[PDB]
Amino acid sequence: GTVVGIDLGTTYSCVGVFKNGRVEIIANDQGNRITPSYVAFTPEGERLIGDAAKNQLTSNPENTVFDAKRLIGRTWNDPSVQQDIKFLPFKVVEKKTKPYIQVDIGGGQTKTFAPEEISAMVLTKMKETAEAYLGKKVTHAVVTVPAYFNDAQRQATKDAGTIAGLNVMRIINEPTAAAIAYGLDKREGEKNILVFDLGGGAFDVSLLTIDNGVFEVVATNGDTHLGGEDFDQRVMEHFIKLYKKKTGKDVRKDNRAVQKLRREVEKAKRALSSQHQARIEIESFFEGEDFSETLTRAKFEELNMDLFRSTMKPVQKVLEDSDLKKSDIDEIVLVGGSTRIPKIQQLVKEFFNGKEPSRGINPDEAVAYGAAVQAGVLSGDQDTGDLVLLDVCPLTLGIETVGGVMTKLIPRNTVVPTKKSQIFSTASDNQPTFTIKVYEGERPLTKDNHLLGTFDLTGIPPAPRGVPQIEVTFEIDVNGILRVTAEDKGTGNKNKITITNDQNRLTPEEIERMVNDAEKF
Amino acid sequence: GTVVGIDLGTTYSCVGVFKNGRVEIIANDQGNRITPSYVAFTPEGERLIGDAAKNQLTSNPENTVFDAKRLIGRTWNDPSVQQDIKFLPFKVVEKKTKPYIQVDIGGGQTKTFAPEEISAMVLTKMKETAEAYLGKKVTHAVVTVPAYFNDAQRQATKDAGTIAGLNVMRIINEPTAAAIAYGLDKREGEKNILVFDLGGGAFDVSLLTIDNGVFEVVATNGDTHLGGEDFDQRVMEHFIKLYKKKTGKDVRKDNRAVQKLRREVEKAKRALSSQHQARIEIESFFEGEDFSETLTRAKFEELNMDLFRSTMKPVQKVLEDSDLKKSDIDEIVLVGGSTRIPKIQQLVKEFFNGKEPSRGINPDEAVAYGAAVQAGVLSGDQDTGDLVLLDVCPLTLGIETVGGVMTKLIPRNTVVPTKKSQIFSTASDNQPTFTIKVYEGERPLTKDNHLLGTFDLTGIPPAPRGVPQIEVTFEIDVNGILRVTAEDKGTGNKNKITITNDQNRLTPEEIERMVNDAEKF
Ligand SMILES: Nc1ncnc2c1ncn2[C@@H]1O[C@H](COP(=O)(O)OP(=O)(O)O)[C@@H](O)[C@H]1O
Ligand SMILES: Nc1ncnc2c1ncn2[C@@H]1O[C@H](COP(=O)(O)OP(=O)(O)O)[C@@H](O)[C@H]1O
Ligand SMILES: [K+]
Ligand SMILES: [K+]
């Protein structure tokens, strides 16, 4: 059917579709063009996906699942997994050497989910978002993954899609999808593309080359634990301390309160990408006490400046790993919501001596956008080939006229079988004979063409030069046999040659060389 | 250099060479195509090899050495050795558990020779025979051994050759060499070959199978003390008795006289394979008395009939040991001089219910002949490989034309890199668009082939169907990357796809299955 493009993100997922000449990024049933990569199991046994899972206020953070993408396709003893489980608030356990997420699904009933089963639930939500917009079933998808993902990680992502009811036609790299969204695949020459992807949870820098249709990921770097959520956490520590100082109320260890503030902090952060002040207000925040503070851009930047500056080192490293200078970068692509932060845009522009990044696609939708473009191309796989093969003459066929001139009867690329005729005459008064020399080739003089045969037409009646009309006909039959006739239209006197393939057939090497001189005259 | 084939025989040795398309069996300096496996040390300290050693009249048979092949590669306490030394007229002694031949080499000076040192002297004679014919040094040989020879016996034979200055490239079995001489290796199916080898000293019957290039020796039997020399000895006992009766002269215990008669008896025996009477005459045979008797075939047969009949039991035994019936024998190969005896040929033909043996190679040269054929094959080991590897397209590449038809642009096994083009047109009047679907596979309909990608060519100007000329080009570059272009030759409007290996590459298992349908159309 119609193929969708899905950005299956660490913190947010996005679905697009190429429809009626345009990429549409599809809003979910909450009206959001991105969906949290979140699943929550309630004590009553209800399952929440997306905004409802993330925005769910609970005193128990242990049955809310996120960051499945950190675990997908990995073994338990992967040092990345052993690091990650330390900070994840839900239980991760080993079963037959693989990490499983352990939750209470209802009334103390424990279940273990594979990371790809959690991601399958997120992809089900993205599928349904697309199905609501299109008003038809979605069966096929292009799904993106980080460039550094190995085969096990790509297959587990495929498996997530399969479980969600999607035929995952292609897994493509996130930075490549962003490049495709910006049309950078459709350009001539060797271009160097720096993709700077600062999302909610991770920072990924990729050096891609585009050369004559081929994308190569040359080098990757970044920080797997640096994203927008770390900036939120700096604002959080600050406002928790400030609230404690102003009211004596310590909101830490009350998860419900932490969630309400974190959500307001995240909205304020986004506002500070457009303006220099933002109000955080929560009516009855903590025991009838309202929350009311404002955050300046300067304070937001001050609380995070070390984290913002740290994004430049991975850029430096991919440049040296790709053996490129700053000036060798033809294209800067900003990906991820956090690239909307003016200080981040400033730090990247300054690093690249004032070079402007690509602009026009929302940075948190660009990967989904590129996936949707690629999905559009692959939806054409069910089209029908509406081409007819033509049988054509591979070389110009003609005769020698006075001065050793190649006079064409059947131009190269004439559809065969065919019959073509021209009228010829005498070069001298009372000329009694014609010699018809049949040539193959594209050169204007027959000395440079291939002789196929000769015959005479005798008994031309007396007349002044140019008066007799001799019709020369070239006929190629359904068997590709060439027959040449010369007939005196005055008398009906005629002669013919049948030209055979035997022993005076050019090799396809010889033909290619002759075809080089085609389209000169 | 040129490799020779040597039959190192119990009683006679034979050397051949594959030269200028033919096996030549090489005559020695006496003009004989076989050479006695004999060495003699004269009282004056001269060493004789071949005909000169055997034909040497002496009153001392103790310093003439033969039958080294009975001892080669064996231990002193081998029951075969303990049996054999009883009848051998030269001294055999034990040194460090191995049998040595002890002779007077000159003036009462004793020397002990390893059996392989005696065989090395015979192989030196065969090497020199070959060198005289070729007029160049012979460095390499294939040497034959009985099928029943163990590793020690094969190595001691190799060692004999090494001592004689030969690189013994291969030791091959006598019956296999005879089969090879008769071309029985170069035939289809499973064939059963009975090799009947009656030489001067031993009888060997071998059941070989030939199956798809592989020879197996399935069973062997025979009699190690039954050969032409036993037939000679029956004629000898008869004529010694007859001479004693007619003259009172007893030639026994006069070795010189015994030798002269034995030599005449052997020539008469050979004549009786071609005619039914033979004259034995020796002028001044014993004290001025001439010898003059004739021998009939009937008397020769009568004196030996029990020995001739005894050759059938070993044939019976190899048939039951190989679990075959007479009728299962596809090929009878007669080897050894004694197979020229008509009564022996008759007994074998009758045993096999009138089946004809192989014919055309002298039975006493057939083993050398096969060795020479094998030598010919191994002389090719110093040739140079004059092949160039081609880089070729493993599967047909093309596009879908109307009706879901696979229209090839690059046939399977086209040399790459390459560029191939065909001309296509519209299926309908004023058709505005082409869809180019790029397929890989050998099947005539693209539903059964592998889709590599699709692209469109838009903006085809109005014309009647079949009039526009769209050139489709398939290009495989030095990196094996496929690029497909479609260009409207009318306008220069064109589009292109670059096809990557990633995620739509067939497995070598899938390719093999598709290649099964190659060469159908
Ligand atoms: N205007 C904005 N200013 C600052 N951060 C933003 C803005 N919009 C979104 N973000 C942040 O972007 C992050 C999400 O990144 P995104 O690219 O959507 O996906 P992912 O986290 O899956 O890579 C969150 O931390 C979010 O707060
Ligand atoms: N025409 C023949 N008739 C009978 N016996 C023959 C004939 N030619 C050769 N022989 C015998 O063949 C024997 C030699 O066998 P041969 O195959 O040459 O080698 P080997 O003894 O080494 O196996 C001798 O006994 C010789 O007399
Ligand atoms: K995302
Ligand atoms: K022999």
Swiss-Prot record, chains A, B:
Region named Substrate-binding (SBD): 393-473
Keywords assigned: Acetylation, ATP-binding, Chaperone, Cytoplasm, Endoplasmic reticulum, Hydrolase, Isopeptide bond, Methylation, Nitration, Nucleotide-binding, Phosphoprotein, Signal, Ubl conjugation
Recorded consequence of changing residue 491 to A: Abolishes AMPylation
Resulting phenotype, residue 498 to A: Does not affect AMPylation
Modified residues (N6-succinyllysine): 420
Record PTM: In unstressed cells, AMPylation at Thr-491 by FICD inactivates the chaperome activity: AMPylated form is locked in a relatively inert state and only weakly stimulated by J domain-containing proteins. In response to endoplasmic reticulum stress, de-AMPylation by the same protein, FICD, restores the chaperone activity.
Any one GO CC term of the record: cell surface
Required for interaction with ELAPOR1: annotated segments: 1-53
One GO biological process term: negative regulation of IRE1-mediated unfolded protein response
EC number(s) on file: 3.6.4.10
Subcellular location: Endoplasmic reticulum lumen; Melanosome; Cytoplasm; Cell surface
Record PTM N6-acetyllysine, positions in chain: 98, 186, 244, 299, 326
Residues the record lists as Phosphoserine modifications: 59
Single GO term (MF): ATP-dependent protein folding chaperone
Residues the record lists as O-AMP-threonine modifications: 491
Predominant location: endoplasmic reticulum
Region described as Nucleotide-binding (NBD): spans on this chain: 98-253
Interdomain linker: region residues: 382-392
Disulfide-linked positions: none
Record note on quaternary structure: Monomer and homooligomer; homooligomerization via the interdomain linker inactivates the chaperone activity and acts as a storage of HSPA5/BiP molecules. Interacts with DNAJC1 (via J domain). Component of an EIF2 complex at least composed of CELF1/CUGBP1, CALR, CALR3, EIF2S1, EIF2S2, HSP90B1 and HSPA5. Part of a large chaperone multiprotein complex comprising DNAJB11, HSP90B1, HSPA5, HYOU, PDIA2, PDIA4, PDIA6, PPIB, SDF2L1, UGGT1 and very small amounts of ERP29, but not, or at very low levels, CALR nor CANX. Interacts with TMEM132A and TRIM21.
Free-text domain note: The interdomain linker regulates the chaperone activity by mediating the formation of homooligomers. Homooligomers are formed by engagement of the interdomain linker of one HSPA5/BiP molecule as a typical substrate of an adjacent HSPA5/BiP molecule. HSPA5/BiP oligomerization inactivates participating HSPA5/BiP protomers. HSPA5/BiP oligomers probably act as reservoirs to store HSPA5/BiP molecules when they are not needed by the cell. When the levels of unfolded proteins rise, cells can rapidly break up these oligomers to make active monomers.
Its job: Endoplasmic reticulum chaperone that plays a key role in protein folding and quality control in the endoplasmic reticulum lumen. Involved in the correct folding of proteins and degradation of misfolded proteins via its interaction with DNAJC10/ERdj5, probably to facilitate the release of DNAJC10/ERdj5 from its substrate. Acts as a key repressor of the EIF2AK3/PERK and ERN1/IRE1-mediated unfolded protein response (UPR).
The protein's name: Endoplasmic reticulum chaperone BiP
Organism for this UniProt entry: Cricetulus griseus (Chinese hamster)
Residues of the full protein shown: 28 to 548 of 654
